[PDB]
């Protein structure tokens, strides 16, 4: 039997599914550790690997990318879980190796690939503490090219009044996603700062794992794909909307939570964002 992870229901994705909006024909690039293309509950449309020692983007040697992918688009059927945009076209853009790390240069090449292959949405459930002019130029270019760019805010928790949002999430062109639990309470590890844009479920998120498995993971890296999937649902209903229109709607229809420093604009509500 199929289970609907609480987070998918929390952002109100099922309401859109019942109306026929499931992310069909929307291309979402999961820039991560790859995606296990053989998972029964996932369909991968294509991809590319930027990791020198791991040239196969469809072999996720970490598990992270597959989990993120499942939150974005686990198939709607009679098994496993259900993604936010179950009909979205998933692309595995591998920029992180088995150990979960990757060079900014590889990530930039992944963003370039996404732009060249007309991705509609980019999800980057990854980050680093170091700023980068080239990385900023890359995400800015993707956004200028019309791509909705979403990234995890980071799991660095709080640090007084200082921002703990990592890169690329910290860049203005990127939608930085924080994590809340099923009670809409900010996860203790969720990064904070003025760069935080929206929140999504990021605690004990059940999704697909390599080798026909499923499991619950924690992280703003689990929250991010809820928003990337949300963008895909919105585009499946309004295919002509620019990324600016998609982002504006997502941020203007959130359910307001706590102070913006800790919750950004609040929890996304994709049903409302779909107008």
């Amino acid at each position: 039997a199929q289970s609907v992870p609480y987070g998918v229901s929390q952002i109100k994705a099922p309401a859109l599914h019942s109306q026929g909006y499931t992310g069909s024909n929307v291309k979402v690039a999961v820039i991560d550790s790859g995606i296990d293309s053989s998972h029964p509950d996932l369909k991968v449309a294509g991809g590319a690997s930027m990791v020198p020692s791991e040239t196969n983007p469809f072999q996720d040697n970490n598990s992270h990318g597959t989990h993120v992918a499942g939150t974005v688009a686990a198939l709607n059927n009679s098994i496993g879980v259900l993604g936010v945009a179950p009909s979205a076209s998933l692309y595995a853009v591998k920029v992180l190796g088995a150990d979960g790390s990757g060079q900014y240069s590889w990530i930039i090449n992944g963003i370039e690939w996404a732009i060249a292959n007309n991705m509609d949405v980019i999800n980057m459930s990854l980050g680093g503490p170091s700023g980068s002019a080239a990385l900023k130029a890359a995400v800015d270019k993707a956004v200028a090219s019309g791509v909705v760019v979403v990234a995890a805010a980071g799991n660095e928790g709080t640090s007084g009044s200082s921002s703990t949002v990592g890169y690329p999430g910290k860049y203005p062109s990127v939608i930085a996603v924080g994590a809340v639990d099923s009670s809409n309470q900010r996860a203790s590890f969720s990064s904070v700062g003025p760069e935080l844009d929206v929140m999504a479920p990021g605690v004990s998120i059940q999704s697909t794992l390599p080798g026909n498995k499923y499991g619950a993971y924690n992280g703003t890296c689990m929250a991010s794909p809820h928003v990337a999937g949300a963008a895909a649902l919105i585009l499946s209903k309004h295919p002509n909307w620019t990324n600016t229109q998609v982002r504006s709607s997502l941020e203007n229809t959130t359910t307001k939570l706590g102070d913006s420093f800790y919750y950004g604009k609040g929890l996304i509500n994709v049903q409302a964002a779909a107008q």
Partner: protein, 76 residues
Amino acid sequence: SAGKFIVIFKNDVSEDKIRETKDEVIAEGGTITNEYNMPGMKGFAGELTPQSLTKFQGLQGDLIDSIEEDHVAHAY
């Protein structure tokens, strides 16, 4: 090697100059591990010898828009 870097060219730099620059990086003893060719964003990544690094830093605003160390990101 001075380390791994990412170099982005100014947008008025010709294709021949871009090619010439990368060939030089290799000739000096460096490497080219990635190349970027997007409208409005051209550059490359690779290992640079010290002489290449300082040359690019000195050419900031002319041939180079930015030159930085190649950082690492993580899925956590």
